[PDB]
Amino acid sequence: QTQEYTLSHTGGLLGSSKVTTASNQTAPQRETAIISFEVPRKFSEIEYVGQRDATRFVPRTTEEITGTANDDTVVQLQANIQPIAGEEDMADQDYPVVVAYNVTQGAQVEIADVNYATDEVTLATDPADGDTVKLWPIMGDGEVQFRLVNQFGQEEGRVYPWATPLYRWHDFPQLKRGREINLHGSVTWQENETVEVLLDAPQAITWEDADYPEGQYVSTFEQDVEITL
Amino acid sequence: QTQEYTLSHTGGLLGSSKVTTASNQTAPQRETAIISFEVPRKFSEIEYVGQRDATRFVPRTTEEITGTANDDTVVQLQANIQPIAGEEDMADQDYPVVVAYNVTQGAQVEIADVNYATDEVTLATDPADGDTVKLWPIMGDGEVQFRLVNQFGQEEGRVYPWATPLYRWHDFPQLKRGREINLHGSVTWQENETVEVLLDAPQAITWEDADYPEGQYVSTFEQDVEITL
Amino acid sequence: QTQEYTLSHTGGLLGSSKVTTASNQTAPQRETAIISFEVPRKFSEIEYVGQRDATRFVPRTTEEITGTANDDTVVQLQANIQPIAGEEDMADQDYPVVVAYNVTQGAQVEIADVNYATDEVTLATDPADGDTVKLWPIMGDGEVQFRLVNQFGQEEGRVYPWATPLYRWHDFPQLKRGREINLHGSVTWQENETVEVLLDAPQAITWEDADYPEGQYVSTFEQDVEITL
Amino acid sequence: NIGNLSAEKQISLYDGQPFISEQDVAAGDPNTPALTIEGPDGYVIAVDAGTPIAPEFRDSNGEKLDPSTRVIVQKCDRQGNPLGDGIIFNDTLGRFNYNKMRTDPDYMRKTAKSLMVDEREIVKVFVDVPDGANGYDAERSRFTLGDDTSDFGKAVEIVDHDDLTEGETQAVKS
Amino acid sequence: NIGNLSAEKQISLYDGQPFISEQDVAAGDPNTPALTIEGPDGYVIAVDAGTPIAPEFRDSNGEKLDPSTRVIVQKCDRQGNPLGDGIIFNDTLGRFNYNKMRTDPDYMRKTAKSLMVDEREIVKVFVDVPDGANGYDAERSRFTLGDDTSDFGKAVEIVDHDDLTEGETQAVKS
Amino acid sequence: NIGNLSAEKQISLYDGQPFISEQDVAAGDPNTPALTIEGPDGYVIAVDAGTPIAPEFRDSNGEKLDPSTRVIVQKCDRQGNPLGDGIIFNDTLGRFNYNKMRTDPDYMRKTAKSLMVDEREIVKVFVDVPDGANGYDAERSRFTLGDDTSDFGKAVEIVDHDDLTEGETQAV
């Protein structure tokens, strides 16, 4: 009676009550938690198996950039940027590495060119004095791990002690058999034995802003599982 | 004395007399015929075998678009567009999904960008008021089948009862071993036991216009066969 | 005590003294030598095995083109051009087939378009009257072979009597398992039993100019070997 | 002449068919099936452990819906009743890379397990749009289940019920 | 030192060779061979059941000719005489996808059967241009028969006639 | 609950770890290593006959250095001493096609042979820039040795020295 299933950063098999989202600590870097997975009312157990099971995670940050009469068109970011699957050609990245949106003009802000490893960007358009823009570059230079909870907060420990980096995460092209991710670890957790992902990085994270254009959800985490019903 | 050969939408082994081309019915969708294959004077028989034999079919439609003083550069189409083999990057589609041609200026009309699944297009150039342009997007959202004739019109029936779609046809990259098409069916037809392809779709089709730039033939069908001499 | 290693057009395991580079004869085509490989002080032997061992060779030529008040933007070349791995789209050639550099303006000269098999090129920029430009197209239409020396100049003979062409060399995409090169031949040479590559072609070759932008070395040859320490 | 054929036939399903059905959907209403497959009379169909899907589910404005969107294929007996014992393809939306995934072996998303469908049994395609997103339309959308033209992919296997003697057994299976 | 080698040698033929010959061709003249391979003296060659070809046959203006164009490789004895008993590679033109088919295992178009060529036997490449098309040129064109550098493809096998005792037998074969 | 695991653990090394080290490099200075891997104590790490590398080695301006550049991985015993009997991955730089080779099986490039690293043994990454080229930086560069996430590529095998009865044999 074992059937594979999929999870999400939102609702799904949990109703947005047996799951939470959360930002992270930045000023002191801390291996904080951003997302949990509580077993809901019904299930007997859940199973994760790295080296058999998949994973996806698309993280982005947020900032705020004004404009000027003699606007710059150019920005710098304190969050290292890389491509995802190959070149930095925004047309063919398999999803963009940057998103932008003007606030005054409730409209997108398209990109002209990127200063690649400089971590600076050139835009296509010309913002105005005192005009606000929101950006959503991807998140790199940060670790990730899994762990577990014994119904209170007493951790069993961790799935697999060694971490994994996010620039690497972006680097490996998702959506390709063999080139998929398959971590290491093998676990099981029954009712209220919640799981929590952890992240250690300087920079922030963003799940929602209510002004992000592309589908209400700035980032995501998605995952495969093998459930006993 | 069995030798493989190739057919065409034009002449070849038939002299453009034992073959015909034809458009389709649009206002009432009908599974009409567009092309036949009459056995010519000579042959003892012809054989088709899906799961062994190949096929190619490049269909395009036609329309007519005027221009304006404050010309639009933008068009919408009532014929769903997709890529062929991969991205919608007109440079590297393995053949374009759109062709355009101005009539006043007897010259091409190059494309800037495509609104992909919106089924709208942006152009590179600026047409003029009352200026005519002819387009030739590809044809999708339509079925296809084969059948047979007993020298009159009394159909034996059909090769393989289930149909096949054309968006799918475009999707599978032609020109790649294994990724080639090999339908299902196995038949034989002697002198005057003509074959007729059939198509059911809303939209039109186009074989020729005499103003299409690229080689006199807007569309094509091509096919492999195993002939007894 | 057998370990695989790599060679170069420069130094490396030879200190730029047990190796030389050289141009070729053009006015009379001669199967001349361009590069050698002397065993250095240390080794007991070296081994090459075609059908097991790899090879890389990126050859380019040189010319000199002035400019004009009513500059042309267009050039012709007496050296046939082809792509490397696929299309002639300079963005995605796996390395360009042409390089250009203005001398007055100590800057690159970008390309707009290529007349492909015509062996002519269109440029992006506008040179000036009496302005010098240096080009470095690739080299095709020429043979290649290997041979050997008995410490003087008395040749043992040749590795494999039949030649190999350079347009073909460019054609086969380097950097792909299976699609790699593996010639035919199997040899061994001890101290001072130098090897010499040979080339027969009309056109020149270029190893260095001291004004080539991309890394001091216009061309290269690189190779794998199996060494006894 | 025509070559004889077996009762088993290899096919690929899609939207513009008679027996299939569809409907538009609004955001935040996962229980609304956008596609309702429906067993034809005297025609059993079959799906092995792995077969492609082309879950093309775009907006009115011809845009794939939010990546947080999810798709759940699900078996149903009669009575319009969903069923947990028997379910295929729980997955997201903004993952497939439509343009190529209809083609390549690698993107190609296969099922979780096999399936059988008697002369009248339903299958539904539930679509969890999170909320506040763009609604769904079908005319600007498609869907498929098989790769029958090609040589590497799988296809749906149909049989006419009359051409068997195990039909009673499969009826007991249900 | 050099490693000894067998008489058998694995090669790949092409245009710019001495013993091969070529010529330009006009439309609607299929009987004109654009390539004339010609047995060298004291050198038998051999082709197994399947070996690649790169039928690069472009226009004066550097464009592959009409897809309705066809290519027929064909054996010939002496007397400049074609022959039906013995023929390879009857195929079209606008099919190969040049740019990759010189490379990939899949595009790679192999022969129909094997072949042998004594010290003077001819092979011809007839080119059926339908009519009214663009003429043929050779300098803007190429041709090949083998994949000897690689590891998956086949190659042409040459032998010197002196290094055999079955040469009389193969001469009787012809 | 958590599932038990073996002592052998599959990982993939890189720049931003503590026990690894690095430094910038100038042109024409092969003997200056840009990376110095160094055995932690109470650990052994192992590399089978073939394991990938991602030898990203870019300029200060974030550009891969000259294709004439060369990379040499090299084992080193203690004493900070290079070693010839025992060496991996002599290669150029201008051969990787970074953007794909981090991913693709064919562009992937493995080692020459296997390797083992006791509790205290060094490995060095020497870089032969020919001359007169652009200087090297490390912050604009990365490096790897394994593909543990994937399913076709290999990975580095770490063990804790305490968890073995063959520890004396692998010490010899």
PDB file of N, CA and C in Angstrom, chain F residues 43-96:
ATOM      1  N   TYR F  43      40.218  10.842   9.777  1.00  0.00           N
ATOM      2  CA  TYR F  43      39.453  10.658   8.560  1.00  0.00           C
ATOM      3  C   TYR F  43      40.354  10.112   7.474  1.00  0.00           C
ATOM      4  N   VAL F  44      39.762   9.318   6.605  1.00  0.00           N
ATOM      5  CA  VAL F  44      40.362   8.929   5.346  1.00  0.00           C
ATOM      6  C   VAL F  44      39.348   9.238   4.260  1.00  0.00           C
ATOM      7  N   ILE F  45      39.846   9.627   3.092  1.00  0.00           N
ATOM      8  CA  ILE F  45      39.001   9.871   1.935  1.00  0.00           C
ATOM      9  C   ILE F  45      39.571   9.104   0.760  1.00  0.00           C
ATOM     10  N   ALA F  46      38.678   8.680  -0.124  1.00  0.00           N
ATOM     11  CA  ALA F  46      39.017   7.755  -1.182  1.00  0.00           C
ATOM     12  C   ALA F  46      38.358   8.193  -2.474  1.00  0.00           C
ATOM     13  N   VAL F  47      39.073   7.921  -3.559  1.00  0.00           N
ATOM     14  CA  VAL F  47      38.690   8.282  -4.912  1.00  0.00           C
ATOM     15  C   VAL F  47      38.983   7.071  -5.779  1.00  0.00           C
ATOM     16  N   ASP F  48      37.970   6.563  -6.464  1.00  0.00           N
ATOM     17  CA  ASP F  48      38.161   5.381  -7.289  1.00  0.00           C
ATOM     18  C   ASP F  48      38.825   5.806  -8.598  1.00  0.00           C
ATOM     19  N   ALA F  49      38.857   4.893  -9.570  1.00  0.00           N
ATOM     20  CA  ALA F  49      39.652   5.099 -10.775  1.00  0.00           C
ATOM     21  C   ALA F  49      39.219   6.334 -11.547  1.00  0.00           C
ATOM     22  N   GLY F  50      37.932   6.657 -11.515  1.00  0.00           N
ATOM     23  CA  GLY F  50      37.406   7.774 -12.264  1.00  0.00           C
ATOM     24  C   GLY F  50      36.370   8.549 -11.490  1.00  0.00           C
ATOM     25  N   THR F  51      36.627   9.843 -11.297  1.00  0.00           N
ATOM     26  CA  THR F  51      35.708  10.735 -10.636  1.00  0.00           C
ATOM     27  C   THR F  51      35.820  12.099 -11.291  1.00  0.00           C
ATOM     28  N   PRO F  52      34.714  12.806 -11.478  1.00  0.00           N
ATOM     29  CA  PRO F  52      34.767  14.071 -12.205  1.00  0.00           C
ATOM     30  C   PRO F  52      35.568  15.125 -11.470  1.00  0.00           C
ATOM     31  N   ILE F  53      35.822  16.204 -12.194  1.00  0.00           N
ATOM     32  CA  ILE F  53      36.330  17.445 -11.635  1.00  0.00           C
ATOM     33  C   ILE F  53      35.543  18.543 -12.332  1.00  0.00           C
ATOM     34  N   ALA F  54      35.387  19.683 -11.658  1.00  0.00           N
ATOM     35  CA  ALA F  54      34.839  20.902 -12.247  1.00  0.00           C
ATOM     36  C   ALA F  54      35.887  22.005 -12.157  1.00  0.00           C
ATOM     37  N   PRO F  55      36.938  21.925 -12.949  1.00  0.00           N
ATOM     38  CA  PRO F  55      38.072  22.840 -12.738  1.00  0.00           C
ATOM     39  C   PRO F  55      37.789  24.246 -13.252  1.00  0.00           C
ATOM     40  N   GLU F  56      36.882  24.937 -12.580  1.00  0.00           N
ATOM     41  CA  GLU F  56      36.639  26.336 -12.893  1.00  0.00           C
ATOM     42  C   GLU F  56      37.794  27.179 -12.395  1.00  0.00           C
ATOM     43  N   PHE F  57      38.453  27.864 -13.318  1.00  0.00           N
ATOM     44  CA  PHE F  57      39.625  28.670 -13.000  1.00  0.00           C
ATOM     45  C   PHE F  57      39.546  29.914 -13.876  1.00  0.00           C
ATOM     46  N   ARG F  58      38.935  30.956 -13.336  1.00  0.00           N
ATOM     47  CA  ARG F  58      38.653  32.167 -14.082  1.00  0.00           C
ATOM     48  C   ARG F  58      39.593  33.294 -13.689  1.00  0.00           C
ATOM     49  N   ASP F  59      39.494  34.371 -14.450  1.00  0.00           N
ATOM     50  CA  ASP F  59      40.248  35.585 -14.234  1.00  0.00           C
ATOM     51  C   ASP F  59      39.579  36.423 -13.150  1.00  0.00           C
ATOM     52  N   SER F  60      40.309  37.438 -12.681  1.00  0.00           N
ATOM     53  CA  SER F  60      39.721  38.474 -11.841  1.00  0.00           C
ATOM     54  C   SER F  60      38.467  39.047 -12.478  1.00  0.00           C
ATOM     55  N   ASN F  61      38.483  39.202 -13.798  1.00  0.00           N
ATOM     56  CA  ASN F  61      37.339  39.668 -14.558  1.00  0.00           C
ATOM     57  C   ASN F  61      36.383  38.532 -14.928  1.00  0.00           C
ATOM     58  N   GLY F  62      36.466  37.403 -14.234  1.00  0.00           N
ATOM     59  CA  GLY F  62      35.501  36.334 -14.376  1.00  0.00           C
ATOM     60  C   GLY F  62      35.501  35.700 -15.746  1.00  0.00           C
ATOM     61  N   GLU F  63      36.692  35.449 -16.269  1.00  0.00           N
ATOM     62  CA  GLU F  63      36.874  34.845 -17.575  1.00  0.00           C
ATOM     63  C   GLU F  63      37.841  33.687 -17.446  1.00  0.00           C
ATOM     64  N   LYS F  64      37.517  32.578 -18.101  1.00  0.00           N
ATOM     65  CA  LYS F  64      38.406  31.433 -18.048  1.00  0.00           C
ATOM     66  C   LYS F  64      39.729  31.806 -18.686  1.00  0.00           C
ATOM     67  N   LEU F  65      40.811  31.411 -18.034  1.00  0.00           N
ATOM     68  CA  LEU F  65      42.124  31.831 -18.466  1.00  0.00           C
ATOM     69  C   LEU F  65      42.469  31.149 -19.784  1.00  0.00           C
ATOM     70  N   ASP F  66      43.682  31.402 -20.257  1.00  0.00           N
ATOM     71  CA  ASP F  66      44.040  31.042 -21.615  1.00  0.00           C
ATOM     72  C   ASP F  66      43.933  29.533 -21.805  1.00  0.00           C
ATOM     73  N   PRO F  67      43.489  29.061 -22.970  1.00  0.00           N
ATOM     74  CA  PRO F  67      43.425  27.612 -23.181  1.00  0.00           C
ATOM     75  C   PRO F  67      44.778  26.950 -23.107  1.00  0.00           C
ATOM     76  N   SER F  68      45.848  27.706 -23.344  1.00  0.00           N
ATOM     77  CA  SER F  68      47.195  27.198 -23.144  1.00  0.00           C
ATOM     78  C   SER F  68      47.478  26.896 -21.682  1.00  0.00           C
ATOM     79  N   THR F  69      46.689  27.454 -20.766  1.00  0.00           N
ATOM     80  CA  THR F  69      46.821  27.143 -19.352  1.00  0.00           C
ATOM     81  C   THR F  69      46.696  25.644 -19.136  1.00  0.00           C
ATOM     82  N   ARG F  70      47.327  25.159 -18.073  1.00  0.00           N
ATOM     83  CA  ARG F  70      47.275  23.753 -17.725  1.00  0.00           C
ATOM     84  C   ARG F  70      47.022  23.567 -16.244  1.00  0.00           C
ATOM     85  N   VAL F  71      46.379  22.451 -15.936  1.00  0.00           N
ATOM     86  CA  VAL F  71      46.055  22.044 -14.584  1.00  0.00           C
ATOM     87  C   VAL F  71      46.745  20.721 -14.326  1.00  0.00           C
ATOM     88  N   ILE F  72      47.308  20.590 -13.132  1.00  0.00           N
ATOM     89  CA  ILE F  72      47.894  19.344 -12.679  1.00  0.00           C
ATOM     90  C   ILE F  72      47.413  19.128 -11.259  1.00  0.00           C
ATOM     91  N   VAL F  73      46.631  18.094 -11.057  1.00  0.00           N
ATOM     92  CA  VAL F  73      46.385  17.609  -9.710  1.00  0.00           C
ATOM     93  C   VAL F  73      47.574  16.758  -9.309  1.00  0.00           C
ATOM     94  N   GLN F  74      47.899  16.756  -8.022  1.00  0.00           N
ATOM     95  CA  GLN F  74      49.078  16.023  -7.596  1.00  0.00           C
ATOM     96  C   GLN F  74      48.949  15.628  -6.140  1.00  0.00           C
ATOM     97  N   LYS F  75      49.171  14.349  -5.871  1.00  0.00           N
ATOM     98  CA  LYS F  75      49.253  13.885  -4.503  1.00  0.00           C
ATOM     99  C   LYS F  75      50.526  14.412  -3.867  1.00  0.00           C
ATOM    100  N   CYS F  76      50.480  14.558  -2.553  1.00  0.00           N
ATOM    101  CA  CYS F  76      51.628  14.950  -1.772  1.00  0.00           C
ATOM    102  C   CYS F  76      51.528  14.216  -0.453  1.00  0.00           C
ATOM    103  N   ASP F  77      52.644  13.661  -0.029  1.00  0.00           N
ATOM    104  CA  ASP F  77      52.733  13.060   1.289  1.00  0.00           C
ATOM    105  C   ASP F  77      52.818  14.192   2.303  1.00  0.00           C
ATOM    106  N   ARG F  78      53.197  13.869   3.524  1.00  0.00           N
ATOM    107  CA  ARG F  78      53.521  14.908   4.480  1.00  0.00           C
ATOM    108  C   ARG F  78      54.799  15.610   4.012  1.00  0.00           C
ATOM    109  N   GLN F  79      55.302  16.519   4.842  1.00  0.00           N
ATOM    110  CA  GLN F  79      56.434  17.399   4.570  1.00  0.00           C
ATOM    111  C   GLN F  79      56.110  18.471   3.541  1.00  0.00           C
ATOM    112  N   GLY F  80      54.846  18.620   3.156  1.00  0.00           N
ATOM    113  CA  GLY F  80      54.492  19.612   2.154  1.00  0.00           C
ATOM    114  C   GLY F  80      55.218  19.378   0.852  1.00  0.00           C
ATOM    115  N   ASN F  81      55.459  18.124   0.526  1.00  0.00           N
ATOM    116  CA  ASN F  81      56.407  17.718  -0.482  1.00  0.00           C
ATOM    117  C   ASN F  81      55.677  17.168  -1.693  1.00  0.00           C
ATOM    118  N   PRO F  82      55.915  17.659  -2.909  1.00  0.00           N
ATOM    119  CA  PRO F  82      55.274  17.035  -4.064  1.00  0.00           C
ATOM    120  C   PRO F  82      55.765  15.617  -4.272  1.00  0.00           C
ATOM    121  N   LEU F  83      54.992  14.880  -5.057  1.00  0.00           N
ATOM    122  CA  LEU F  83      55.281  13.490  -5.351  1.00  0.00           C
ATOM    123  C   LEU F  83      54.884  13.190  -6.786  1.00  0.00           C
ATOM    124  N   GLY F  84      55.705  12.390  -7.456  1.00  0.00           N
ATOM    125  CA  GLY F  84      55.512  12.075  -8.857  1.00  0.00           C
ATOM    126  C   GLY F  84      54.861  10.725  -9.030  1.00  0.00           C
ATOM    127  N   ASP F  85      55.380   9.732  -8.320  1.00  0.00           N
ATOM    128  CA  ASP F  85      54.724   8.434  -8.263  1.00  0.00           C
ATOM    129  C   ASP F  85      53.454   8.614  -7.455  1.00  0.00           C
ATOM    130  N   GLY F  86      52.349   8.789  -8.160  1.00  0.00           N
ATOM    131  CA  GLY F  86      51.104   9.220  -7.570  1.00  0.00           C
ATOM    132  C   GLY F  86      50.791  10.611  -8.062  1.00  0.00           C
ATOM    133  N   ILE F  87      49.944  10.680  -9.083  1.00  0.00           N
ATOM    134  CA  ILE F  87      49.570  11.946  -9.683  1.00  0.00           C
ATOM    135  C   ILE F  87      48.316  11.707 -10.499  1.00  0.00           C
ATOM    136  N   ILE F  88      47.457  12.710 -10.538  1.00  0.00           N
ATOM    137  CA  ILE F  88      46.155  12.615 -11.172  1.00  0.00           C
ATOM    138  C   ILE F  88      45.989  13.829 -12.064  1.00  0.00           C
ATOM    139  N   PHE F  89      45.298  13.632 -13.186  1.00  0.00           N
ATOM    140  CA  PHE F  89      44.676  14.721 -13.932  1.00  0.00           C
ATOM    141  C   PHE F  89      45.700  15.784 -14.340  1.00  0.00           C
ATOM    142  N   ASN F  90      46.534  15.392 -15.294  1.00  0.00           N
ATOM    143  CA  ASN F  90      47.281  16.348 -16.095  1.00  0.00           C
ATOM    144  C   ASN F  90      46.420  16.715 -17.291  1.00  0.00           C
ATOM    145  N   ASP F  91      46.097  17.996 -17.418  1.00  0.00           N
ATOM    146  CA  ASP F  91      45.186  18.428 -18.460  1.00  0.00           C
ATOM    147  C   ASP F  91      45.469  19.885 -18.775  1.00  0.00           C
ATOM    148  N   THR F  92      44.938  20.343 -19.900  1.00  0.00           N
ATOM    149  CA  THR F  92      44.909  21.765 -20.167  1.00  0.00           C
ATOM    150  C   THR F  92      43.778  22.408 -19.376  1.00  0.00           C
ATOM    151  N   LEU F  93      43.566  23.692 -19.634  1.00  0.00           N
ATOM    152  CA  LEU F  93      42.381  24.415 -19.201  1.00  0.00           C
ATOM    153  C   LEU F  93      41.371  24.548 -20.317  1.00  0.00           C
ATOM    154  N   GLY F  94      41.838  24.693 -21.545  1.00  0.00           N
ATOM    155  CA  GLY F  94      40.967  25.097 -22.620  1.00  0.00           C
ATOM    156  C   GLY F  94      40.185  23.966 -23.231  1.00  0.00           C
ATOM    157  N   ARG F  95      39.668  23.065 -22.404  1.00  0.00           N
ATOM    158  CA  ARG F  95      39.100  21.820 -22.882  1.00  0.00           C
ATOM    159  C   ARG F  95      37.818  21.421 -22.160  1.00  0.00           C
ATOM    160  N   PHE F  96      37.326  22.207 -21.214  1.00  0.00           N
ATOM    161  CA  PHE F  96      36.278  21.680 -20.352  1.00  0.00           C
ATOM    162  C   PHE F  96      34.877  22.010 -20.832  1.00  0.00           C
TER     163      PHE F  96
END
